[PDB]
Amino acid sequence: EAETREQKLLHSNNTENVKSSKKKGNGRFLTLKPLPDSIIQESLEIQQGVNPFFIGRSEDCNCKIEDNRLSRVHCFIFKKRHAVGKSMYESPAQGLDDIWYCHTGTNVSYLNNNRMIQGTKFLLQDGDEIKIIWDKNNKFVIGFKVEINDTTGLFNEGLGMLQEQRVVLKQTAEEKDLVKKL
User: What domains can you pick out in the chain, each with its CATH number?
Assistant: First the structure.
């Protein structure tokens, strides 16, 4: 209980939160945690792989990294079905969904160790510290930390199942003829 019962708004204690004042994870998959080394500092939340989740100096992106070096829609993250490797394989992965970091601005964004060169795409993983921007010449880096908290049906449960087999992939499908408009 908490209130006399039915008055401010209605029903059981805190209405047992049917619509729920609380929520957390109602459609969240990744929490972008920018660190202090990055001009940004806190934690963002990409909803269940918004697909796509742009990010840059233009709020038009699914997020906002307020960083001048960003050319508006500076970087462009995407999300889609894992899609098993083309050929061979034994147990595919129908369903699930992989993420795709893809820089599209005029500059370059990256993923821990893979430097993208605009209009480029790349795969993302859990705890994948990314860097929307990186200009050591004038002390300006956007250190970020991809933190997958859901991983419900996320293929590979988000955990970079590898040691060294994921390099930046140039654009594709014209930013899927959808991210190409930014």
Answer: 1-182 (2.60.200.20)
